[PDB]
From Swiss-Prot:
Homodimer. Required for the formation of a threonylcarbamoyl group on adenosine at position 37 (t(6)A37) in mitochondrial tRNAs that read codons beginning with adenine. Probably involved in the transfer of the threonylcarbamoyl moiety of threonylcarbamoyl-AMP (TC-AMP) to the N6 group of A37. Involved in mitochondrial genome maintenance. GO terms for molecular function: metal ion binding; N(6)-L-threonylcarbamoyladenine synthase activity; nucleotidase activity; tRNA binding. It comes from Saccharomyces cerevisiae (strain ATCC 204508 / S288c). It is found in: Mitochondrion. Binds 1 divalent metal cation per subunit. This is tRNA N6-adenosine threonylcarbamoyltransferase, mitochondrial. The gene is QRI7. Its cofactor is a divalent metal cation. SUPFAM superfamilies: Actin-like ATPase domain. PROSITE patterns: GLYCOPROTEASE.
Length: 344
């Protein structure tokens, strides 16, 4: 009366494998195993570590002969990295004679806040703001298969920009932007507010490439290291970056009011979404808000597994064993591409 899912994420630099326990359809699934091997070349890393990782996962999950579904990121991303997990997933599927689902990567980010409350919250339609180190997108979700991008970044992601500006202040570490928030919060009022920093179609867009450039052209009028000044500058940096996002979100909500007539829930996921100041400006300068945890907003295979559970039960669809990776996969063309198949 229940089943288990083997999930593989291989679109990014980190290799991710998970085992989910869908013990009941009237309850949120549980995680039996969730591993990430960080790249610390892209196609080789997955190719060399996808094997030992899953083996380790099946041992820890204690269910090598109990998984009933294989979910793997089909795209988008680099063909070399995607293949490493996709070809491997097929091997698992053929050996176990079990169904396979080629999952869209962005679909995982959008659907993962539902998993906690099964499929209840949030409900369609809902809007989502994916703000990570690789994504900066605003998406409308009308259905499990109907997703529309309303605003996407042009150059880099917000996380990529904040880190780049964080290393110029300069902070170090795995996640630089997260560290930059701390030094500015320790002196949230204790920082000397003396510096007045200077920061800056047929489809609305984000942009973050100029923030590092504008940052360099302001430290050139001052000096490059007073913590009362450091915490002050860092505040104005993240503020203006968040200002750009809120401004573009406003433009979207004002341009297409008909799109947003029946949505009452805003989802902000991605690594950057853990930023309290960002969370605050969203709720202030804009209808519920949902903030997914940190261990799910970052790239992982759990969201891939849950996404597969979504499409297997709701759409009753499955992927053919001949599916190839997709470099550029438009979210609106989710079911347009070969080759989906029904179990219904
Ligand atoms: N609390 C935070 N505030 C701002 N940025 C963050 C925070 N936590 C993580 N990040 C950034 O999010 C990115 C990683 O998220 P992800 O790409 O989802 O793995 C990195 O650029 C981090 O610096
Ligand atoms: Zn991602």
């Amino acid at each position: 009366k229940g089943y288990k899912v083997l999930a593989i994420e291989t679109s990014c630099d980190d290799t991710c494998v998970s085992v989910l326990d869908r013990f009941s359809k009237s309850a949120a699934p549980n995680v039996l195993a969730n591993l990430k091997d960080t790249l610390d070349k892209a196609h080789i890393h997955h190719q060399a570590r996808i094997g030992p990782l899953t083996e380790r996962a099946l041992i820890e999950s204690n269910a090598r002969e109990g998984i009933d579904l294989i979910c793997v990121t089909r795209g988008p991303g680099m063909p070399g990295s995607l293949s490493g997990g996709l070809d491997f997933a097929k091997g698992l599927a053929v050996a176990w004679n079990k169904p396979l689902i080629g999952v869209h990567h962005m679909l995982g980010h959008l659907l993962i806040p539902r998993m906690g409350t099964n499929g209840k919250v949030p409900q369609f339609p809902f809007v989502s703001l994916l703000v990570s180190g690789g994504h900066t997108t605003f998406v409308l979700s009308r259905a499990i298969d109907d997703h529309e991008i309303l605003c996407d970044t042009i150059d880099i992601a917000v996380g990529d920009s904040l880190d780049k500006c964080g290393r110029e202040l300069g902070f170090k570490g795995t996640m630089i932007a997260r560290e930059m928030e701390k030094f500015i919060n320790q002196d949230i009022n204790d920082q000397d507010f003396a510096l007045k920093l200077e920061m800056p179609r047929n489809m609305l867009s984000f942009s973050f490439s100029a923030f590092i450039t504008a940052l360099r052209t302001n430290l050139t009028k001052l000096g490059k290291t007073p913590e009362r000044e450091i915490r002050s500058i860092a505040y104005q940096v993240q503020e203006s970056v968040f200002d750009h996002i809120i401004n573009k979100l406003k433009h979207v909500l004002k341009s297409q009011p008909e799109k947003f007539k029946n949505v009452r829930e805003f989802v902000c996921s991605g690594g950057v979404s853990s930023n309290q100041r960002l969370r605050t400006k969203l709720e202030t300068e804009l209808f519920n808000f949902y903030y997914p945890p940190m261990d799910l907003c970052s790239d992982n295979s759990i969201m891939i597994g849950w996404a597969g559970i979504e499409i297997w039960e709701s759409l009753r669809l499955v992927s053919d064993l001949d599916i190839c990776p997709i470099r550029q996969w438009p979210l609106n063309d989710l079911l347009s591409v070969d080759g989906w198949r029904t179990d219904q």
